PDB file of all heavy atoms in Angstrom:
ATOM      1  N   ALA G 232     -15.028  15.537 -17.759  1.00 19.48           N
ATOM      2  CA  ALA G 232     -14.958  15.253 -16.330  1.00 19.48           C
ATOM      3  C   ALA G 232     -13.788  16.099 -15.814  1.00 19.48           C
ATOM      4  O   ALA G 232     -12.771  16.136 -16.350  1.00 19.48           O
ATOM      5  CB  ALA G 232     -14.696  13.792 -16.052  1.00 19.48           C
ATOM      6  N   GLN G 233     -14.069  16.825 -14.712  1.00 22.18           N
ATOM      7  CA  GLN G 233     -13.058  17.676 -14.105  1.00 22.18           C
ATOM      8  C   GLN G 233     -12.364  17.136 -12.856  1.00 22.18           C
ATOM      9  O   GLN G 233     -11.462  17.746 -12.240  1.00 22.18           O
ATOM     10  CB  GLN G 233     -13.709  18.997 -13.744  1.00 22.18           C
ATOM     11  CG  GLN G 233     -14.281  19.762 -15.139  1.00 22.18           C
ATOM     12  CD  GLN G 233     -15.314  20.676 -14.772  1.00 22.18           C
ATOM     13  OE1 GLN G 233     -16.464  20.291 -14.375  1.00 22.18           O
ATOM     14  NE2 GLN G 233     -15.132  21.922 -15.005  1.00 22.18           N
ATOM     15  N   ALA G 234     -12.721  15.903 -12.441  1.00 21.52           N
ATOM     16  CA  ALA G 234     -12.149  15.133 -11.279  1.00 21.52           C
ATOM     17  C   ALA G 234     -12.533  13.723 -11.523  1.00 21.52           C
ATOM     18  O   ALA G 234     -13.432  13.351 -12.291  1.00 21.52           O
ATOM     19  CB  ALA G 234     -12.753  15.743 -10.021  1.00 21.52           C
ATOM     20  N   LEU G 235     -11.910  12.816 -10.862  1.00 23.11           N
ATOM     21  CA  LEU G 235     -12.191  11.425 -11.028  1.00 23.11           C
ATOM     22  C   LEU G 235     -12.072  10.637  -9.604  1.00 23.11           C
ATOM     23  O   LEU G 235     -11.181  10.914  -8.806  1.00 23.11           O
ATOM     24  CB  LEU G 235     -11.048  10.686 -11.851  1.00 23.11           C
ATOM     25  CG  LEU G 235     -11.156  11.048 -13.313  1.00 23.11           C
ATOM     26  CD1 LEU G 235      -9.884  10.444 -14.001  1.00 23.11           C
ATOM     27  CD2 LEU G 235     -12.403  10.569 -13.982  1.00 23.11           C
ATOM     28  N   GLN G 236     -12.977   9.810  -9.466  1.00 20.75           N
ATOM     29  CA  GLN G 236     -12.969   9.027  -8.110  1.00 20.75           C
ATOM     30  C   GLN G 236     -13.037   7.507  -8.457  1.00 20.75           C
ATOM     31  O   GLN G 236     -13.750   7.098  -9.281  1.00 20.75           O
ATOM     32  CB  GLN G 236     -14.223   9.296  -7.273  1.00 20.75           C
ATOM     33  CG  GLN G 236     -14.213   8.609  -5.982  1.00 20.75           C
ATOM     34  CD  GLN G 236     -14.987   9.153  -4.826  1.00 20.75           C
ATOM     35  OE1 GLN G 236     -14.945  10.326  -4.597  1.00 20.75           O
ATOM     36  NE2 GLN G 236     -15.704   8.238  -4.087  1.00 20.75           N
ATOM     37  N   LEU G 237     -12.032   6.862  -7.833  1.00 21.68           N
ATOM     38  CA  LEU G 237     -12.032   5.403  -7.997  1.00 21.68           C
ATOM     39  C   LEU G 237     -12.587   4.804  -6.732  1.00 21.68           C
ATOM     40  O   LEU G 237     -12.153   5.050  -5.624  1.00 21.68           O
ATOM     41  CB  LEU G 237     -10.544   4.905  -8.219  1.00 21.68           C
ATOM     42  CG  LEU G 237     -10.353   3.606  -8.902  1.00 21.68           C
ATOM     43  CD1 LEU G 237     -10.785   3.572 -10.357  1.00 21.68           C
ATOM     44  CD2 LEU G 237      -8.858   3.186  -8.684  1.00 21.68           C
ATOM     45  N   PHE G 238     -13.645   3.881  -6.884  1.00 20.26           N
ATOM     46  CA  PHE G 238     -14.320   3.289  -5.783  1.00 20.26           C
ATOM     47  C   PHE G 238     -13.712   1.844  -5.628  1.00 20.26           C
ATOM     48  O   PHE G 238     -13.913   1.008  -6.429  1.00 20.26           O
ATOM     49  CB  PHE G 238     -15.726   3.175  -5.971  1.00 20.26           C
ATOM     50  CG  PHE G 238     -16.514   4.484  -5.832  1.00 20.26           C
ATOM     51  CD1 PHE G 238     -16.689   5.331  -6.885  1.00 20.26           C
ATOM     52  CD2 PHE G 238     -17.114   4.809  -4.654  1.00 20.26           C
ATOM     53  CE1 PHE G 238     -17.351   6.536  -6.910  1.00 20.26           C
ATOM     54  CE2 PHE G 238     -17.897   6.049  -4.580  1.00 20.26           C
ATOM     55  CZ  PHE G 238     -18.014   6.900  -5.755  1.00 20.26           C
ATOM     56  N   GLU G 239     -13.126   1.632  -4.425  1.00 23.93           N
ATOM     57  CA  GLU G 239     -12.530   0.338  -4.154  1.00 23.93           C
ATOM     58  C   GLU G 239     -13.613  -0.114  -2.976  1.00 23.93           C
ATOM     59  O   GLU G 239     -13.173  -0.104  -1.872  1.00 23.93           O
ATOM     60  CB  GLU G 239     -11.188   0.405  -3.605  1.00 23.93           C
ATOM     61  CG  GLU G 239     -10.468  -0.961  -3.240  1.00 23.93           C
ATOM     62  CD  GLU G 239     -10.280  -1.784  -4.576  1.00 23.93           C
ATOM     63  OE1 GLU G 239     -11.176  -2.312  -5.138  1.00 23.93           O
ATOM     64  OE2 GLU G 239      -9.045  -1.840  -5.002  1.00 23.93           O
ATOM     65  N   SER G 240     -14.791  -0.328  -3.382  1.00 23.89           N
ATOM     66  CA  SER G 240     -15.982  -0.594  -2.386  1.00 23.89           C
ATOM     67  C   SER G 240     -15.837  -1.865  -1.577  1.00 23.89           C
ATOM     68  O   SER G 240     -16.372  -1.950  -0.515  1.00 23.89           O
ATOM     69  CB  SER G 240     -17.189  -0.599  -3.163  1.00 23.89           C
ATOM     70  OG  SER G 240     -17.409   0.601  -3.936  1.00 23.89           O
ATOM     71  N   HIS G 241     -15.100  -2.777  -2.061  1.00 24.27           N
ATOM     72  CA  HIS G 241     -14.884  -4.192  -1.327  1.00 24.27           C
ATOM     73  C   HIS G 241     -13.449  -4.303  -0.884  1.00 24.27           C
ATOM     74  O   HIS G 241     -12.924  -5.450  -0.930  1.00 24.27           O
ATOM     75  CB  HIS G 241     -15.263  -5.232  -2.279  1.00 24.27           C
ATOM     76  CG  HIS G 241     -16.762  -5.253  -2.662  1.00 24.27           C
ATOM     77  ND1 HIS G 241     -17.214  -5.920  -3.825  1.00 24.27           N
ATOM     78  CD2 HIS G 241     -17.771  -4.616  -2.136  1.00 24.27           C
ATOM     79  CE1 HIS G 241     -18.493  -5.679  -3.949  1.00 24.27           C
ATOM     80  NE2 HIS G 241     -18.982  -4.891  -2.913  1.00 24.27           N
ATOM     81  N   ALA G 242     -12.850  -3.205  -0.474  1.00 25.26           N
ATOM     82  CA  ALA G 242     -11.483  -3.229   0.050  1.00 25.26           C
ATOM     83  C   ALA G 242     -11.362  -3.950   1.382  1.00 25.26           C
ATOM     84  O   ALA G 242     -10.498  -4.792   1.672  1.00 25.26           O
ATOM     85  CB  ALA G 242     -11.050  -1.787   0.221  1.00 25.26           C
ATOM     86  N   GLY G 243     -12.408  -3.695   2.207  1.00 25.59           N
ATOM     87  CA  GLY G 243     -12.446  -4.247   3.539  1.00 25.59           C
ATOM     88  C   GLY G 243     -12.475  -5.783   3.736  1.00 25.59           C
ATOM     89  O   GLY G 243     -12.139  -6.288   4.853  1.00 25.59           O
ATOM     90  N   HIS G 244     -12.787  -6.462   2.749  1.00 23.83           N
ATOM     91  CA  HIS G 244     -12.722  -8.027   2.733  1.00 23.83           C
ATOM     92  C   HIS G 244     -11.284  -8.523   2.707  1.00 23.83           C
ATOM     93  O   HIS G 244     -11.027  -9.632   3.155  1.00 23.83           O
ATOM     94  CB  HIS G 244     -13.589  -8.549   1.604  1.00 23.83           C
ATOM     95  CG  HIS G 244     -15.021  -8.123   1.598  1.00 23.83           C
ATOM     96  ND1 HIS G 244     -15.939  -8.849   2.405  1.00 23.83           N
ATOM     97  CD2 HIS G 244     -15.629  -7.145   0.928  1.00 23.83           C
ATOM     98  CE1 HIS G 244     -17.117  -8.207   2.223  1.00 23.83           C
ATOM     99  NE2 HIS G 244     -16.950  -7.277   1.345  1.00 23.83           N
ATOM    100  N   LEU G 245     -10.492  -7.802   2.269  1.00 27.61           N
ATOM    101  CA  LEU G 245      -8.972  -8.060   2.168  1.00 27.61           C
ATOM    102  C   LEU G 245      -8.414  -7.598   3.423  1.00 27.61           C
ATOM    103  O   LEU G 245      -8.783  -6.576   4.035  1.00 27.61           O
ATOM    104  CB  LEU G 245      -8.286  -7.583   0.962  1.00 27.61           C
ATOM    105  CG  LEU G 245      -8.870  -7.924  -0.374  1.00 27.61           C
ATOM    106  CD1 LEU G 245      -8.014  -7.125  -1.437  1.00 27.61           C
ATOM    107  CD2 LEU G 245      -8.818  -9.315  -0.653  1.00 27.61           C
ATOM    108  N   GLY G 246      -7.234  -8.227   3.910  1.00 24.78           N
ATOM    109  CA  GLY G 246      -6.500  -7.708   5.106  1.00 24.78           C
ATOM    110  C   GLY G 246      -5.321  -7.026   4.348  1.00 24.78           C
ATOM    111  O   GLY G 246      -5.235  -6.936   3.183  1.00 24.78           O
ATOM    112  N   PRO G 247      -4.398  -6.511   5.201  1.00 21.54           N
ATOM    113  CA  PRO G 247      -3.243  -5.672   4.767  1.00 21.54           C
ATOM    114  C   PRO G 247      -2.537  -6.468   3.659  1.00 21.54           C
ATOM    115  O   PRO G 247      -2.313  -5.954   2.482  1.00 21.54           O
ATOM    116  CB  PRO G 247      -2.379  -5.555   5.983  1.00 21.54           C
ATOM    117  CG  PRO G 247      -3.413  -5.373   7.052  1.00 21.54           C
ATOM    118  CD  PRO G 247      -4.482  -6.507   6.650  1.00 21.54           C
ATOM    119  N   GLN G 248      -2.117  -7.626   3.957  1.00 24.38           N
ATOM    120  CA  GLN G 248      -1.251  -8.459   3.031  1.00 24.38           C
ATOM    121  C   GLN G 248      -1.936  -8.674   1.622  1.00 24.38           C
ATOM    122  O   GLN G 248      -1.267  -8.464   0.627  1.00 24.38           O
ATOM    123  CB  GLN G 248      -0.869  -9.771   3.612  1.00 24.38           C
ATOM    124  CG  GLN G 248       0.081  -9.648   4.754  1.00 24.38           C
ATOM    125  CD  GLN G 248       0.346 -10.924   5.642  1.00 24.38           C
ATOM    126  OE1 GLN G 248       1.257 -11.677   5.331  1.00 24.38           O
ATOM    127  NE2 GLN G 248      -0.547 -11.223   6.468  1.00 24.38           N
ATOM    128  N   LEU G 249      -3.138  -9.171   1.492  1.00 18.67           N
ATOM    129  CA  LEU G 249      -3.824  -9.476   0.317  1.00 18.67           C
ATOM    130  C   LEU G 249      -4.078  -8.169  -0.500  1.00 18.67           C
ATOM    131  O   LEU G 249      -3.867  -8.098  -1.653  1.00 18.67           O
ATOM    132  CB  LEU G 249      -5.047 -10.158   0.430  1.00 18.67           C
ATOM    133  CG  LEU G 249      -5.122 -11.640   0.554  1.00 18.67           C
ATOM    134  CD1 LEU G 249      -6.445 -12.156   0.474  1.00 18.67           C
ATOM    135  CD2 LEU G 249      -4.218 -12.347  -0.451  1.00 18.67           C
ATOM    136  N   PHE G 250      -4.334  -7.038   0.331  1.00 15.51           N
ATOM    137  CA  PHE G 250      -4.623  -5.735  -0.370  1.00 15.51           C
ATOM    138  C   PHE G 250      -3.393  -5.267  -1.002  1.00 15.51           C
ATOM    139  O   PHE G 250      -3.485  -4.766  -2.153  1.00 15.51           O
ATOM    140  CB  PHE G 250      -5.101  -4.814   0.819  1.00 15.51           C
ATOM    141  CG  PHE G 250      -5.592  -3.439   0.210  1.00 15.51           C
ATOM    142  CD1 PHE G 250      -6.851  -3.208  -0.172  1.00 15.51           C
ATOM    143  CD2 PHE G 250      -4.647  -2.416   0.026  1.00 15.51           C
ATOM    144  CE1 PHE G 250      -7.277  -1.963  -0.685  1.00 15.51           C
ATOM    145  CE2 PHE G 250      -5.024  -1.104  -0.552  1.00 15.51           C
ATOM    146  CZ  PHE G 250      -6.408  -0.935  -0.834  1.00 15.51           C
ATOM    147  N   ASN G 251      -2.222  -5.273  -0.309  1.00 15.69           N
ATOM    148  CA  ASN G 251      -1.049  -4.810  -0.884  1.00 15.69           C
ATOM    149  C   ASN G 251      -0.654  -5.628  -2.062  1.00 15.69           C
ATOM    150  O   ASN G 251       0.178  -5.172  -2.922  1.00 15.69           O
ATOM    151  CB  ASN G 251       0.097  -4.795   0.224  1.00 15.69           C
ATOM    152  CG  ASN G 251      -0.097  -3.723   1.172  1.00 15.69           C
ATOM    153  OD1 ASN G 251      -0.924  -2.884   1.030  1.00 15.69           O
ATOM    154  ND2 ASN G 251       0.547  -3.855   2.309  1.00 15.69           N
ATOM    155  N   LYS G 252      -1.001  -6.799  -2.112  1.00 16.42           N
ATOM    156  CA  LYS G 252      -0.620  -7.820  -3.126  1.00 16.42           C
ATOM    157  C   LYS G 252      -1.578  -7.685  -4.361  1.00 16.42           C
ATOM    158  O   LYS G 252      -0.973  -7.675  -5.590  1.00 16.42           O
ATOM    159  CB  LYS G 252      -0.751  -9.251  -2.603  1.00 16.42           C
ATOM    160  CG  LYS G 252       0.554 -10.113  -2.784  1.00 16.42           C
ATOM    161  CD  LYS G 252       0.349 -11.415  -1.805  1.00 16.42           C
ATOM    162  CE  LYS G 252       1.639 -12.269  -2.024  1.00 16.42           C
ATOM    163  NZ  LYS G 252       1.570 -13.376  -1.056  1.00 16.42           N
ATOM    164  N   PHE G 253      -2.806  -7.674  -4.185  1.00 16.65           N
ATOM    165  CA  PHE G 253      -3.704  -7.637  -5.307  1.00 16.65           C
ATOM    166  C   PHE G 253      -4.604  -6.408  -5.618  1.00 16.65           C
ATOM    167  O   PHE G 253      -5.200  -6.333  -6.723  1.00 16.65           O
ATOM    168  CB  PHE G 253      -4.619  -8.833  -5.148  1.00 16.65           C
ATOM    169  CG  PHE G 253      -4.039 -10.134  -5.142  1.00 16.65           C
ATOM    170  CD1 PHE G 253      -3.662 -10.827  -3.992  1.00 16.65           C
ATOM    171  CD2 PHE G 253      -3.599 -10.802  -6.355  1.00 16.65           C
ATOM    172  CE1 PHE G 253      -3.116 -12.072  -3.954  1.00 16.65           C
ATOM    173  CE2 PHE G 253      -3.037 -12.038  -6.426  1.00 16.65           C
ATOM    174  CZ  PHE G 253      -2.767 -12.622  -5.218  1.00 16.65           C
ATOM    175  N   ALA G 254      -4.669  -5.520  -4.640  1.00 14.09           N
ATOM    176  CA  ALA G 254      -5.488  -4.299  -4.849  1.00 14.09           C
ATOM    177  C   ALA G 254      -4.630  -3.049  -4.989  1.00 14.09           C
ATOM    178  O   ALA G 254      -4.772  -2.310  -5.991  1.00 14.09           O
ATOM    179  CB  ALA G 254      -6.520  -4.087  -3.696  1.00 14.09           C
ATOM    180  N   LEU G 255      -3.693  -2.804  -4.046  1.00 11.84           N
ATOM    181  CA  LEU G 255      -2.818  -1.622  -4.134  1.00 11.84           C
ATOM    182  C   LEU G 255      -2.042  -1.358  -5.430  1.00 11.84           C
ATOM    183  O   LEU G 255      -2.055  -0.237  -5.962  1.00 11.84           O
ATOM    184  CB  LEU G 255      -1.863  -1.604  -2.917  1.00 11.84           C
ATOM    185  CG  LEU G 255      -1.119  -0.339  -2.850  1.00 11.84           C
ATOM    186  CD1 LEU G 255      -2.017   0.826  -2.573  1.00 11.84           C
ATOM    187  CD2 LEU G 255      -0.063  -0.513  -1.601  1.00 11.84           C
ATOM    188  N   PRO G 256      -1.372  -2.436  -5.942  1.00 14.84           N
ATOM    189  CA  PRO G 256      -0.444  -2.195  -7.168  1.00 14.84           C
ATOM    190  C   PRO G 256      -1.341  -1.678  -8.303  1.00 14.84           C
ATOM    191  O   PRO G 256      -0.892  -0.662  -9.010  1.00 14.84           O
ATOM    192  CB  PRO G 256      -0.042  -3.633  -7.528  1.00 14.84           C
ATOM    193  CG  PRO G 256       0.060  -4.234  -6.150  1.00 14.84           C
ATOM    194  CD  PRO G 256      -1.222  -3.848  -5.579  1.00 14.84           C
ATOM    195  N   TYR G 257      -2.566  -2.038  -8.521  1.00 14.14           N
ATOM    196  CA  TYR G 257      -3.454  -1.710  -9.616  1.00 14.14           C
ATOM    197  C   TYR G 257      -4.031  -0.352  -9.317  1.00 14.14           C
ATOM    198  O   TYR G 257      -4.324   0.413 -10.258  1.00 14.14           O
ATOM    199  CB  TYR G 257      -4.500  -2.788  -9.850  1.00 14.14           C
ATOM    200  CG  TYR G 257      -3.834  -4.083 -10.132  1.00 14.14           C
ATOM    201  CD1 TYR G 257      -3.660  -4.987  -9.185  1.00 14.14           C
ATOM    202  CD2 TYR G 257      -3.114  -4.348 -11.424  1.00 14.14           C
ATOM    203  CE1 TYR G 257      -2.912  -6.245  -9.445  1.00 14.14           C
ATOM    204  CE2 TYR G 257      -2.500  -5.547 -11.684  1.00 14.14           C
ATOM    205  CZ  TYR G 257      -2.429  -6.499 -10.725  1.00 14.14           C
ATOM    206  OH  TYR G 257      -1.683  -7.672 -10.916  1.00 14.14           O
ATOM    207  N   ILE G 258      -4.389  -0.051  -8.056  1.00 12.97           N
ATOM    208  CA  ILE G 258      -4.927   1.214  -7.612  1.00 12.97           C
ATOM    209  C   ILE G 258      -3.794   2.303  -7.937  1.00 12.97           C
ATOM    210  O   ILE G 258      -4.108   3.390  -8.461  1.00 12.97           O
ATOM    211  CB  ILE G 258      -5.119   1.360  -6.051  1.00 12.97           C
ATOM    212  CG1 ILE G 258      -6.396   0.556  -5.742  1.00 12.97           C
ATOM    213  CG2 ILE G 258      -5.341   2.755  -5.671  1.00 12.97           C
ATOM    214  CD1 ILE G 258      -6.681   0.219  -4.306  1.00 12.97           C
ATOM    215  N   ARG G 259      -2.576   1.914  -7.870  1.00 13.82           N
ATOM    216  CA  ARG G 259      -1.374   2.801  -8.172  1.00 13.82           C
ATOM    217  C   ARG G 259      -1.240   2.938  -9.591  1.00 13.82           C
ATOM    218  O   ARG G 259      -1.107   4.061 -10.067  1.00 13.82           O
ATOM    219  CB  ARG G 259      -0.142   2.297  -7.531  1.00 13.82           C
ATOM    220  CG  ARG G 259       0.043   2.357  -6.013  1.00 13.82           C
ATOM    221  CD  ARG G 259       1.141   1.724  -5.401  1.00 13.82           C
ATOM    222  NE  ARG G 259       2.432   2.090  -6.074  1.00 13.82           N
ATOM    223  CZ  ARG G 259       3.160   3.211  -5.739  1.00 13.82           C
ATOM    224  NH1 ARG G 259       2.813   3.966  -4.659  1.00 13.82           N
ATOM    225  NH2 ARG G 259       4.250   3.442  -6.286  1.00 13.82           N
ATOM    226  N   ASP G 260      -1.317   1.888 -10.359  1.00 16.63           N
ATOM    227  CA  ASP G 260      -1.183   1.812 -11.805  1.00 16.63           C
ATOM    228  C   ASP G 260      -2.219   2.729 -12.536  1.00 16.63           C
ATOM    229  O   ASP G 260      -1.903   3.351 -13.458  1.00 16.63           O
ATOM    230  CB  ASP G 260      -1.294   0.435 -12.374  1.00 16.63           C
ATOM    231  CG  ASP G 260      -0.061  -0.456 -12.062  1.00 16.63           C
ATOM    232  OD1 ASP G 260       1.016   0.147 -11.760  1.00 16.63           O
ATOM    233  OD2 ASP G 260      -0.183  -1.661 -12.158  1.00 16.63           O
ATOM    234  N   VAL G 261      -3.363   2.662 -11.987  1.00 12.27           N
ATOM    235  CA  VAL G 261      -4.476   3.535 -12.592  1.00 12.27           C
ATOM    236  C   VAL G 261      -4.211   5.035 -12.627  1.00 12.27           C
ATOM    237  O   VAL G 261      -4.218   5.629 -13.596  1.00 12.27           O
ATOM    238  CB  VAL G 261      -5.868   3.244 -11.907  1.00 12.27           C
ATOM    239  CG1 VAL G 261      -6.865   4.221 -12.442  1.00 12.27           C
ATOM    240  CG2 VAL G 261      -6.397   1.767 -12.319  1.00 12.27           C
ATOM    241  N   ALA G 262      -3.947   5.482 -11.311  1.00 10.07           N
ATOM    242  CA  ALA G 262      -3.607   6.954 -11.225  1.00 10.07           C
ATOM    243  C   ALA G 262      -2.339   7.260 -12.055  1.00 10.07           C
ATOM    244  O   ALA G 262      -2.366   8.387 -12.800  1.00 10.07           O
ATOM    245  CB  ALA G 262      -3.282   7.342  -9.848  1.00 10.07           C
ATOM    246  N   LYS G 263      -1.292   6.525 -12.016  1.00 11.24           N
ATOM    247  CA  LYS G 263      -0.087   6.794 -12.790  1.00 11.24           C
ATOM    248  C   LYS G 263      -0.417   6.921 -14.310  1.00 11.24           C
ATOM    249  O   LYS G 263      -0.003   7.849 -14.964  1.00 11.24           O
ATOM    250  CB  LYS G 263       0.905   5.713 -12.551  1.00 11.24           C
ATOM    251  CG  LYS G 263       2.293   6.044 -13.192  1.00 11.24           C
ATOM    252  CD  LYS G 263       3.290   4.906 -12.942  1.00 11.24           C
ATOM    253  CE  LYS G 263       4.614   5.200 -13.683  1.00 11.24           C
ATOM    254  NZ  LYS G 263       5.656   4.088 -13.474  1.00 11.24           N
ATOM    255  N   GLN G 264      -0.999   5.800 -14.839  1.00 10.58           N
ATOM    256  CA  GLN G 264      -1.390   5.755 -16.239  1.00 10.58           C
ATOM    257  C   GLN G 264      -2.336   6.825 -16.790  1.00 10.58           C
ATOM    258  O   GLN G 264      -2.251   7.338 -17.911  1.00 10.58           O
ATOM    259  CB  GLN G 264      -1.675   4.382 -16.630  1.00 10.58           C
ATOM    260  CG  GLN G 264      -0.589   3.359 -16.461  1.00 10.58           C
ATOM    261  CD  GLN G 264      -0.908   1.974 -16.980  1.00 10.58           C
ATOM    262  OE1 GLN G 264      -1.548   1.865 -18.008  1.00 10.58           O
ATOM    263  NE2 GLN G 264      -0.431   1.038 -16.258  1.00 10.58           N
ATOM    264  N   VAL G 265      -3.241   7.071 -15.925  1.00 11.88           N
ATOM    265  CA  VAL G 265      -4.360   8.106 -16.216  1.00 11.88           C
ATOM    266  C   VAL G 265      -3.635   9.495 -16.410  1.00 11.88           C
ATOM    267  O   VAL G 265      -3.825  10.145 -17.431  1.00 11.88           O
ATOM    268  CB  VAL G 265      -5.493   8.113 -15.324  1.00 11.88           C
ATOM    269  CG1 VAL G 265      -6.389   9.311 -15.651  1.00 11.88           C
ATOM    270  CG2 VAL G 265      -6.394   6.872 -15.449  1.00 11.88           C
ATOM    271  N   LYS G 266      -2.771   9.834 -15.477  1.00  9.75           N
ATOM    272  CA  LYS G 266      -2.095  11.107 -15.462  1.00  9.75           C
ATOM    273  C   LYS G 266      -1.153  11.215 -16.615  1.00  9.75           C
ATOM    274  O   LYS G 266      -1.186  12.274 -17.324  1.00  9.75           O
ATOM    275  CB  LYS G 266      -1.299  11.365 -14.180  1.00  9.75           C
ATOM    276  CG  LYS G 266      -2.117  11.473 -12.918  1.00  9.75           C
ATOM    277  CD  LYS G 266      -1.332  11.698 -11.695  1.00  9.75           C
ATOM    278  CE  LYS G 266      -2.195  11.914 -10.489  1.00  9.75           C
ATOM    279  NZ  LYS G 266      -1.352  12.221  -9.287  1.00  9.75           N
TER     280      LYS G 266
END
């Protein structure tokens, strides 16, 4: 694979607060650890 896309298809169900609490940290961890 020469590129990677992470689909957070159900992001919209969360509001800013829940997203930053339960989705964002792991979205960050994935890119960091993969690199």
Side-chain angles (χ1 to χ4, degrees):
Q233 298 156 296
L235 291 171
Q236 179 158 319
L237 198 70
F238 290 85
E239 186 69 284
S240 307
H241 299 161
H244 297 282
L245 302 181
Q248 293 173 96
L249 278 190
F250 187 90
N251 291 346
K252 234 168 182 176
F253 300 98
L255 187 65
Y257 306 97
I258 286 164
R259 288 171 54 84
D260 288 340
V261 170
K263 184 184 179 180
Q264 295 186 38
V265 170
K266 290 178 182 189

